[model samples]
Target: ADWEAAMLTLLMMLKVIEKADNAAQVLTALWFMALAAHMAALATPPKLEDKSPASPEMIDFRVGFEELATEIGKAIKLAALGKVKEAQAAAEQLKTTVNAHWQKYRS
Candidate 1:
């Protein structure tokens, strides 16, 4: 789905972001991510939970954003298991959640 494309784009963009030769590349990558987020919101019709200045959707959105506070949240957990497979599982789940609710499901 589009979210996968979005994630791929993000990872690719992050490459240059990490090794940015100058301030422009870093700033450009940041601005690009922000633009992607803004565009996502604009394209999807509003869900009621998203309407209030601070609402439930805002809370859930965080988990959905960057697949839960960065790196899919399972890399650390998987390290405990001595198997990094869970990390990828977390990513797939993250991908699924975003796709399932891409346009908002709550009222």
Candidate 2:
């Protein structure tokens, strides 16, 4: 998938986390989806078809991707410890970061 598709998939996984009713559900969701989510969030940015490497927009997009990846990692750790609320909070933060990235970078 392209960058936009990958980000959207990550957002969808976060939404699953948001709707989870308990730690068990959260764990289940993360167990299945978190790896793919991380792959999308942590993968190196692809070269933009028309943008230069030094583009400020590209730099900002990469930074946002890093931020999103960090939040996802935090959420996974919190969930592993059964800190359901904290994990959910991290998922919310990731959602916000992912949305910002989408708005900034989506074609």
Candidate 3:
């Protein structure tokens, strides 16, 4: 639930960036805020209410979460540096990563 909320916040921020004035400062601010949301969500790893602690599925889910966090960090850094197009591309990749793993674990 927390991860989903963070993902939605990041998506909303990206939408805002698309319509925002072309200003590096504003973009940077928004990107950093997105990063903060992502990081906070990541602070507590997802809890698998149905899975045992040491189960393979739980480990796989944790790995997927790490990959998602890495992608978010990369995208945010690019966006913060004012590389809008590249950042969007990175975000596309991030979406791909999410689609690859989210459904398996999503409740």
Candidate 4:
């Protein structure tokens, strides 16, 4: 239920941006969409949480998420500037990282 609600809310926000008048605006809107989705995912309860001072998996997840977010931002920027070939490479990496993370964390 939480996942469904989150996904629908994300789409609602994304749809509003799709109505903007131009390609440039849509490109910019993607930045917000990515940001909102990232935040929403973070806000959801983790499948496993250890409040312990040290935990390898949580650390790894955090590091991986940070890297993915950074690369996705770079990919979006590159795509917005019409460097799509290079952007595709970055986007592919981003998607792969996301898939890996989801596979690990999904309930």
Which one is best on lDDT? 2
In terms of lDDT, the poorest run of 10 residues in model 3 is 40-49
Query: For model 3, how does the per-residue alpha-carbon lDDT over 31-98 read when each residue is reduced to its tens digit?
Result: 55456555654333354656776888767766766776677677767877777777767666766775
lDDT, model 1, position 53: 46
lDDT (C-alpha) at residue 94 in model 1: 46
- Candidate with top TM-score is 2
Error of 4 at 99 (Å): 0.5
Tens-place lDDT digits, model 1, residues 72-100: 33433443444434434443454455455
List the candidate 3 regions with Cα displacement exceeding 4 Å: 10-47
Model 2 alpha-carbon miss at residue 95, Å: 1.4
lDDT (Cα) of model 4:
0.56
lDDT against the true structure, each candidate: 0.46, 0.70, 0.61, 0.56
- What would the per-residue lDDT of candidate 4 be over residues 28-61, giving only the tens digit for each residue? 6457546655766554325766544367766776
Model 2, residue 40: what's the lDDT? 61
* Comparing 1 and 2 on TM-score, the stronger one: 2
Better model by lDDT, 2 or 4? 2
Global fold similarity of model 4 (TM-score): 0.60
Answer with 3 or 4, whichever has the higher TM-score: 3
lDDT of 4 at 48: 63
